[PDB]
């Protein structure tokens, strides 16, 4: 029986479903007047095809697959019973093989149920996603190596490898979130080694959510990162490789500054050496002060000239606006002559857009920019379309 | 074996302190007169000339005299004045017509004595000097500056360097060694000792070059003689062999001067010898004392020609006491040594037995010379 | 005053002294015997070893003279001819108290076969108080009936003369009065420091002379047997008489040696009496006069005066007779030579210690005994000089 | 009434005797002239015997006699002298009148020779208004000069108005003769004298001028005087002198010549004892031989102002007597001199005070100079100064407490640099006179002696101890070891001091060593290499010495005996490196000449180190020039530091930063692109010559202590980036490097 068990799992590692799809439904011609036990295990394949490829699409608008897949129990807890059977040996080696998948189809539901889990939530203002690791952690700290024979080679480290870029992925989704500039720097180029190796290497919805979502994390993370970058650079070079990439907001932000002329441009952040690496060893010191809320990311001239009191004046005392991460603040400073457009995208980071010129509180063009800087940057899409 | 007692004397001031070593006398003016020398540790040298009491002239050195000498010791035919001050210096300064001398050459430290003479028989005349620790040392007069020469370690302390006739009939080098003992130093161009018992440590003297006829001062000696402090002396003669023994005394007294003068007049020369407290002895060839008991404690001593009065060479001896003075008796001459009487004087002449046995019992012969002497009518 | 010659004597030994002597130290034995002022006295002679001879100073030890006692004065002689013996005598005080005990003692060992031995003679002790101090012990020979006999004399703080002669009978020595054998030596004023008896040999008279402390000389002419004064002469000078000497150049003379005068000598006594002097020229310059003697030192058979002075001089004056005939010098006495001595001089003598018929000079010094020779050389020469004068004179002028 | 018959001889005299009788006549008759005994004289008219046998005469009448005709005779008597022979003479044409007259030369008058001796003396029988007399014995006859010569003081200082002149009686002639000795001779004398004021002219005389209107006359009062002398009797015969003038003068006369004989007397007592005669003629033996006598007062000055024993075993007044006082001043002074010796033996002998000066001196005067030893100094460059006064002083110190080690007492000079020290003994005192002169340090030895040969042949073991080599010695090689632990150029004093004791004496206890070391240094300069090596000596535990000037090496340590250990090192021909070196040696326990293995086995240790210093430490000498030119063959000098370096990796400084070593080699290719272009002034391009093993080096603007590296070797595809250390400031090193290695990733994810 072991010489048809060639093409087996190894030909379903790829995305190819259509060779074991039709090869288990022949079986029944496939394995002619052989040992009534392997059908068992060919027709819980045949139907785990199915179930894969229902993940797959991760679609689930009977809906949702929870108990669905363990309707694909009895036969992975019992293929073997012990033309007769000649009994263990390599008629028991399906049971060995058995126990291998069956906490592939666990941890499959329990993969899923977070999957449910992110679409559940799918809303608010701030999505955790350090809790998100920590409740991820269990499942693969459960399912680590007990499914480990030979022939699972293929799906055996392409589903832990997919969560592990999730892992990458998801940690990543905390540590940029807390200015981690080299553990974020890191996290992705683990995961990008390994999604063009299996991604690239040939789609479902998994696939192009899961690169909607690294490239929305590249394009805010040559963002966030910006001042950094562009010192240790060429002069106008860099601006070809946040060129290459989707939204791009220092590409964006430099048609506003140059048709409307905004003058004056900058990304707070409440509270850390600064900016760069710096050894773990080295003199820390405390985010602490009257202005410790740094302006990491200015895109016109140097921060303002005499006013940055309201920058965070305006901040802490209008502070029940931003906090619903769904509107923007305006004031007007009598002798600066600055009206102020800060807006939250984020629970730490926000931007002001401070002016130098009447702006009057009817400026809807620019309310429009920012919404869609925001509805790019709160991770709405990428979780709203979790499913087509 | 008698005693006398000398009258004529001079009495010289002196003020100041001298090692036993730093006292002579000779010609310094080249006059064929005799002229006392004597060096003090503070650093001046008198001369004392006639009968005067004052110092004839003073001539100033540099540092603590030791030594002092007058001879023919630049070979040039003068006769020189020579000073060594215990340091390193050497003076010479020309006395022949204050007084600050004209010449300057530093030499080993240590310098105990001095003696100038030619030891190896070349007609130059050297200079040698015996150091307090055992070490002899040779110079000359190199044609001016005085370079060095030989030098001889020793394990005895030094006393006295004399230089003598040797055995073959060449001049000889002896220095002294505690124990009664000396030693000959090998020719300059390694040292032989000799032992003549007593403590090992008794100090002893030595001099030698002593006259034996009328005329042979210019060349010839053999007899030499040795003094010990705790008192005894010894006359020794060359030879070839061996050392012949001529005389040994043993005094009573501490003995610490040793030279030669001639008192008789016949040519010969005698020893003489002073203590610390001025019993003085002279001897003859022929064991036969004479001494002179100076009531005083003495320093130094000197026995030599001097030119007293009258300008006219005569024996004198010399005497340093603690009582500041120099004491120069000179007419010390005696008619002979031992003692007779005219009967025994007049035995030895035949023309007196030819004179009785033409005029035809010892009282026969006294009441004949009575008659004669006292009743010539 | 200047010498006109050299002198002529040689030293030959030196015996030095603990402590000084005085003039009374010397006296006769042929020997020599001096002593010191603290009991000590030495006996001089000489030894003959085969062709030279050895000056010998060998100690006395007396008996009867205790450790504290002091001598004075001593003297001694030789028994009259008919009785042969040596007579020792010894004057001393005992220091008893402050105030001083005068003794004598008188030594003679009677015992035949040893009478001249001195050692017998050092222990015959005669003790004898004084009740004077005494000066100076002198001895006279006397021809007393027949015989001729030798007495002491004494001189006392007591200004008398005392006599002591021996006795025939019980052989002691006790003192007699002096007026039955000198009747010239009563009723003096002053204490009598040396006194001369000069007898006149082959007959019975003789010649007294004394001089004392103040002065006063005495000469008087006796007769023995008589026993009578036959003429008196006085004189008063100056200053201790030291010395008076009576000598012979008939036709006798004296020598008188103040202490503070120089020398004179009185001529012609016998014909003139004590009116004619000579006085030695410059014989004053060297402190004062202590001894003196006269006797023959040029060998010529003629007197010569020595005197020996404090300044350590030993002066001798010879005679310029009228032999000479220069009136202006006729009779005089000149300076022969001047000798000089390292200690004050006391006392002489004239005695041949040797034994060749030549008379040494032994000088009494502060500090010893010197013994002067003449120069033997010197004397050699005119021996045989005088031998060849007279080997031919025996027969070209006498046959 | 009574009457009283007179000569006719005064005939024209009756006037001249009314003042000679009144002068008489005034003193028995206290005052026609009356007078009170009632008496009234009245003058009437009518071969010494006869002139004047008691012609005018005496009418009086009474209200005696015997008196009355005494003071005639006085008239007479005084007034035949006054006038028959005073007015005598005493003795071109002007220049022998006035010299007879003083009798200096010539003869007296025969008056003054005879007949005025006897006259004068007839009036003491007779009651006269001026005469006198005395009389003297003498014990003998010096005494004239010295009693002529102060009585003519007396005279004079009495009443200077008389002038004394002497006239002998010149032995031979006869009276009448008195011109201006011999023994046993009766010397004679008249020393008269006479005032020369009373001629041409008639309270110290005792008469008046009578009256010069009473008759119209000179009275003849003029006044003379006369001493007699006959052997040994003087005689006074005054004239007019006042009463008691005349009798004190008669009274001093009398007391000088009692004087004079109380000098004969003590004088007397001298003679008798210069021939031995001390018991017979003793002092006091008989106003001035009583037991209270001034007995140097004698035998001094003529005037009135044990001895017995004095010379025993030892003007004749002036002379026999200057002679005693000199006697007895040489035993006032041998006294004065042997207790002050005595004094400081028995003070320094059993008790174990500052002594003055001139006591030293006395005590060196009396002492005899037995020994002596000198020593050079060797530090002074003038002897070949304070640097040298200080040194001199300390080891003038440390030899005097060595001297008090063996028994040896400082001595005190006691006010009124040379130091003395003392020791005494039963045989004698030991002195030392320690001093330092010009160059040389010297030391002499007095002696003063005090059975006998227990002192001299002992003292000679003061001699044998005395050490002044060994002493210099060891003072000189520890005057070396101080220097070193801390110009004076220190190799050039040790060349002398080896030059000037090559052997060394036995006795001491410090050694010295002089080698040289020879390193072979073939690649870099010997002259090269000690200049680096002094640069760095505190790495190489030694130090350096500031010596045109030149460098020394030096070490210490305590090695045990012999105590510490002290090096001196000093530098075809320019690869050789010769290097001088010296041993010191110094103890501790003792510091004085107490009387070489371990030195040859230190110069063991001294050699290895003098090996390892070079052997070893030489590597460093020439990596500060690879420093140098690694700033800014090349490719291989590169290797070579890293051949001896430490490197560490960046895995072993931060954990995260392991992720770059598990990366493709590709990427540092690109990597290193991005610096060669970004900073070309601080990276370093080498690469091999078929360039499969490339480096690249970044320096620091001052972190020069540490080096990033950036290796690439596509051959073999081996690679590593390595921190190489010669650690705050690295980090700042460690930032800028960081970025790009970050950045190029970045290219990477787009």
């Given at each position: ?388 | ?132 620790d055992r070490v002899v040392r040779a110079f000359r007069w190199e044609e001016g500056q005085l370079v060095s020469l030989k030098k001889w370690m020793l394990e005895g302390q030094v006393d006295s360097l004399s230089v003598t006739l040797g055995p073959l009939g060449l001049p000889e080098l002896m220095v002294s060694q505690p124990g009664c003992a000396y030693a000959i130093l090998l020719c300059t161009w390694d040292v032989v000792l000799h032992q003549t018992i007593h403590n090992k440590n008794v100090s002893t003297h030595l001099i030698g070059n002593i006259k034996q006829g009328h005329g042979t001062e210019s060349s010839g000696s053999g007899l030499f003689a040795l ?151 | ?399 | ?750």
């Open positions: 029986e072991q010489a048809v068990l060639e093409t087996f799992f190894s030909h379903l590692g790829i995305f190819s479903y259509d060779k074991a799809k039709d090869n288990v439904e022949k079986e029944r011609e496939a394995n002619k007047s052989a040992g009534g036990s392997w059908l068992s295990l060919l027709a819980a394949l045949a139907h785990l095809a199915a179930a894969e490829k229902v993940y797959h699409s991760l679609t689930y608008l009977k809906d949702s697959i929870r108990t669905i897949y363990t309707s694909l129990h009895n036969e992975l807890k019992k293929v073997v019973t012990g033309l007769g059977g000649t009994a263990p040996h390599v008629e028991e080696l399906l049971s060995h093989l058995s126990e291998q998948l069956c906490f592939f189809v666990q941890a499959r539901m329990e993969i899923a149920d977070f999957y449910e889990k992110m679409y559940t939530l799918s809303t608010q203002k701030f999505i955790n996603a350090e809790e998100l690791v920590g409740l991820l952690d269990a499942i693969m700290k459960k399912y680590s190596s007990r499914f480990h024979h030979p022939i699972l080679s293929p799906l055996e480290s392409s589903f832990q490898l997919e969560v592990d870029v999730l892992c990458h992925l998801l940690k990543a989704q905390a540590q940029v979130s807390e200015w981690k500039f080299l553990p974020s720097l890191v996290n992705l180029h683990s995961a990008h080694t390994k999604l063009q190796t299996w991604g690239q290497i040939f789609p479902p919805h998994l696939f192009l959510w899961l690169m909607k979502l690294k490239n929305m994390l590249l394009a805010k993370f040559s963002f966030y990162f910006h001042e950094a970058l562009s010192r240790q650079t060429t002069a106008s070079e860099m601006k070809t490789l946040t060129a290459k990439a989707n939204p791009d907001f220092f590409g964006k932000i430099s048609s506003f500054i140059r048709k409307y002329d905004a003058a004056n441009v900058s990304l707070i952040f409440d509270n850390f050496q600064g900016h760069g690496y710096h050894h773990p060893h080295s003199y820390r010191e405390a985010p602490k002060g009257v202005d410790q809320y740094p302006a990491v990311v200015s895109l016109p001239s140097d921060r303002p000239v005499m006013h940055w009191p309201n920058v965070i004046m305006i901040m802490t005392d209008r502070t029940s606006d931003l906090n619903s991460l769904e509107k923007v603040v305006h004031f007007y400073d009598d002798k600066v002559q600055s009206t102020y457009f800060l807006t939250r995208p984020e629970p730490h980071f926000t931007i002001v857009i401070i002016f130098e010129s009447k702006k009057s509180e009817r400026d809807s063009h620019f309310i429009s920019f920012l919404n869609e800087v925001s509805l790019a940057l709160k991770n709405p899409k990428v979780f709203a379309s979790l499913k087509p | 074996m008698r005693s006398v007692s000398y009258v004529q004397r001079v009495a010289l001031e002196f003020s100041g302190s001298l090692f036993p070593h730093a006292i002579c006398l000779g010609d310094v003016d080249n006059d064929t007169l005799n002229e006392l020398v004597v060096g003090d540790t503070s650093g001046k040298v008198s001369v004392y000339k006639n009968d005067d009491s004052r110092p004839w002239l003073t001539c100033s050195c540099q540092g603590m005299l030791t030594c002092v000498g007058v001879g023919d010791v630049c070979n040039k035919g003068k006769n020189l004045l020579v000073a060594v001050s215990a340091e390193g210096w050497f003076h010479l300064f020309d006395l022949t017509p204050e007084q600050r001398p004209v010449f300057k050459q530093h030499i080993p430290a240590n310098t105990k004595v001095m003696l100038i003479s030619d030891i190896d028989g070349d007609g130059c005349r050297e200079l040698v000097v015996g150091y307090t003094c010990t402090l705790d008192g005894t002396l010894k006359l020794m003669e060359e030879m070839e062999e061996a050392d012949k023994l001529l005389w040994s005394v043993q005094v009573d007294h501490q003995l610490f001067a040793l030279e030669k003068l001639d008192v008789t007049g016949n040519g010969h020369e005698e020893v003489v010898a002073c203590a610390w407290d001025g019993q003085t002895y002279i001897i003859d060839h022929n064991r036969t004392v004479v001494r002179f008991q100076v009531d005083e404690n003495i320093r130094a001593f000197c026995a030599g020609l001097y030119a007293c009065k009258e300008g006219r060479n005569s024996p004198c001896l010399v005497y340093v006491t603690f009582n500041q003075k120099i004491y120069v008796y000179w007419e010390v001459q005696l008619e002979r040594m031992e003692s007779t009487n005219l009967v025994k004087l007049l035995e030895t002449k035949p023309e007196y037995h030819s004179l009785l046995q033409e005029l035809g019992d010892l009282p026969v012969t006294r009441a004949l010379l009575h008659q004669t002497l006292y009743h010539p009518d | 005053a200047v010498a006109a010659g050299p002198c002529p004597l040689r030293e030959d030994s030196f015996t030095r002294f603990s402590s000084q002597s005085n003039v009374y130290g010397l006296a006769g034995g042929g020997e020599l015997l001096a002593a010191t002022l603290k009991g000590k006295v030495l006996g001089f002679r000489y030894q003959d070893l085969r062709q030279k001879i050895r000056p010998v100073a060998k100690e006395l030890q007396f008996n009867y003279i205790p450790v504290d006692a002091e001598i004075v004065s001593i003297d001694t002689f030789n028994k009259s001819p008919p009785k042969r013996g040596l007579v020792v005598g010894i004057t001393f005080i005992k220091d008893s108290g402050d105030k001083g005990s005068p003794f004598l003692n008188i030594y003679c060992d009677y015992e035949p076969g040893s009478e001249y031995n001195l050692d017998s003679i050092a222990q015959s002790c005669l003790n004898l108080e004084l009740q004077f101090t005494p000066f100076q012990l002198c001895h006279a020979e006397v021809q007393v009936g027949d015989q001729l006999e030798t007495v002491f004399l004494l001189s006392g703080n007591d200004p008398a003369i005392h006599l002591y002669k021996e006795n025939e009978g019980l052989h002691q020595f006790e003192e007699q009065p002096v007026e039955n054998l000198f009747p010239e030596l009563t009723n003096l004023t002053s204490s009598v420091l040396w006194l001369d008896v000069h007898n006149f040999p082959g007959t019975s008279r003789r010649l007294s002379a004394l001089g004392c402390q103040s002065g006063y000389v005495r000469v008087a002419h006796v007769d023995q047997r008589s026993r009578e004064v036959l003429q008196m002469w006085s004189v008063l000078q100056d200053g201790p008489i030291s010395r008076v000497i009576v000598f012979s150049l008939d036709e006798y003379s004296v020598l008188v040696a103040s202490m503070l005068e120089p020398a004179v000598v009185y001529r012609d006594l016998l014909n003139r009496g004590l009116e004619d002097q000579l006085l030695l020229p410059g014989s004053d310059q060297f402190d004062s006069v202590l001894c003196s003697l006269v006797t023959d030192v040029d060998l010529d058979g003629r007197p010569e005066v020595l005197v020996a002075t404090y300044g350590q001089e030993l002066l001798c004056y010879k005679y310029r007779g009228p032999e000479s005939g220069l009136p202006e010098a006729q009779h005089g006495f000149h300076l022969l030579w001047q000798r000089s001595f390292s200690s004050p001089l006391l006392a002489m003598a004239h005695v041949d210690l040797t034994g060749d018929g030549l008379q040494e000079l032994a000088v009494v010094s502060l500090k010893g005994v010197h013994i002067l020779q003449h120069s033997l050389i010197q004397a050699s020469e005119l021996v045989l000089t005088r031998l060849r004068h007279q080997v031919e004179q025996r027969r070209r002028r006498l046959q | 009434v009574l009457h009283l018959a007179l000569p006719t001889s005064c005939r024209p005299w009756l006037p001249a005797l009314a003042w000679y009788l009144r002068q008489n006549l005034l003193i028995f008759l206290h005052s026609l002239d009356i007078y009170l005994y009632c008496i009234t004289l009245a003058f009437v008219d009518e071969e010494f015997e006869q002139l004047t046998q008691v012609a005018p005469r005496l009418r009086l009448d009474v209200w005696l006699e015997e008196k009355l005709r005494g003071a005639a005779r006085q008239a007479l008597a005084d007034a035949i002298i006054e006038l028959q022979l005073l007015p005598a003479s005493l003795c071109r044409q002007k220049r022998r009148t006035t010299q007879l007259e003083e009798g200096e030369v010539g003869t007296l008058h025969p008056v003054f020779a005879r007949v005025a001796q006897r006259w004068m003396e007839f009036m003491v029988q007779i009651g006269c208004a001026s005469v006198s007399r005395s009389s003297a014995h003498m014990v003998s006859r010096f005494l004239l000069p010295s009693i002529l010569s102060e009585f003519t003081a007396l005279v004079t200082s009495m009443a200077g108005d008389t002038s004394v002149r002497i006239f002998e009686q010149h032995l031979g002639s006869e009276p009448e003769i008195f011109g201006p000795p011999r023994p046993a001779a009766e010397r004679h004398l008249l020393l008269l004298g006479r005032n020369f004021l009373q001629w041409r002219r008639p309270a110290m005389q005792r008469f008046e001028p009578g009256g010069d209107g009473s008759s119209g006359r000179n009275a003849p009062r003029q006044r003379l005087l006369l001493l007699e002398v006959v052997d040994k009797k003087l005689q006074l015969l005054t004239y007019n002198w006042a009463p008691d003038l005349g009798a004190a003068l008669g009274r001093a006369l009398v007391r000088l010549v009692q004087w004079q004989n109380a000098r004969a007397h003590l004088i007397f007592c001298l003679l008798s004892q210069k021939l031995g005669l001390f018991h017979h003629y003793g002092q006091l033996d008989f106003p001035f031989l009583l037991p209270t006598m001034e007995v140097e007062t004698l035998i001094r000055s003529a005037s009135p102002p044990p001895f017995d024993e004095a010379l025993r075993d030892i003007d004749p007044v002036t002379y026999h007597g200057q002679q005693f006082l000199e006697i007895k001043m040489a035993e006032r002074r041998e006294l004065e001199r042997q207790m002050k010796m005595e004094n400081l033996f028995v003070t320094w002998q059993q008790r174990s005070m500052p002594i003055s000066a001139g006591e030293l001196e006395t005590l060196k005067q009396s002492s005899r100079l037995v020994h002596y030893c000198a020593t050079a100094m060797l530090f002074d460059p003038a002897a070949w100064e304070p640097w040298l006064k200080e040194l001199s002083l300390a080891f003038l110190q440390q030899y005097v407490q060595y001297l008090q080690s063996i028994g040896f007492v400082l001595v005190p000079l006691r006010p009124p640099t040379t130091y003395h020290l003392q020791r005494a003994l039963p045989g004698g005192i030991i002195l030392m006179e320690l001093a330092f002169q010009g160059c040389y340090f010297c030391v002499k030895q007095f002696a003063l002696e005090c059975l006998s040969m227990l002192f001299t042949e002992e003292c000679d073991k003061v001699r044998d101890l005395m050490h002044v080599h060994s002493f210099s010695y060891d003072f000189h090689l520890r005057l070396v070891h101080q220097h070193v632990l801390g110009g004076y150029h220190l190799t050039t004093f040790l060349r002398h001091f080896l030059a000037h004791h090559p052997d060394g004496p036995h006795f001491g206890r410090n050694h010295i060593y002089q080698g040289t070391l020879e390193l072979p240094t073939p690649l870099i300069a010997a002259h090269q290499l000690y200049n680096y090596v002094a640069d760095h000596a505190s790495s190489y535990h030694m130090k350096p010495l500031r010596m045109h000037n030149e460098y020394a090496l030096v070490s210490a340590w305590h090695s045990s005996d012999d105590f510490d250990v002290s090096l001196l090192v000093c530098h075809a021909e320019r690869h050789v490196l010769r290097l001088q070196f010296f041993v010191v040696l110094t103890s501790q326990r003792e510091l004085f000449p107490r009387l070489f293995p371990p030195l040859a086995a230190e110069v063991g240790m001294a050699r290895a180190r003098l090996a390892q210093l070079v052997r070893l430490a030489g590597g460093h000498c020439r990596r500060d020039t690879l420093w140098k030119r690694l700033f800014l063959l090349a490719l291989a000098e590169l290797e070579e530091l890293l051949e001896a370096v430490h490197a560490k990796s960046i895995g072993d400084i931060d954990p995260q930063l392991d992720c770059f070593l598990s990366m493709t080699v590709s990427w540092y290719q690109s990597l290193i692109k991005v610096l060669l272009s970004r900073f070309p002034q601080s990276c370093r391009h080498f690469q091999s010559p078929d360039l499969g093993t490339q480096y690249l080096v970044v320096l620091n603007q001052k972190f020069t202590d540490c080096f990033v590296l950036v290796f690439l070797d596509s051959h073999l595809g081996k690679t590593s980036l390595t921190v190489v250390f010669r650690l705050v400031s690295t980090y700042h090193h460690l930032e800028s490097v960081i970025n790009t290695a970050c950045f190029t990733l970045w290219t990477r994810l787009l």
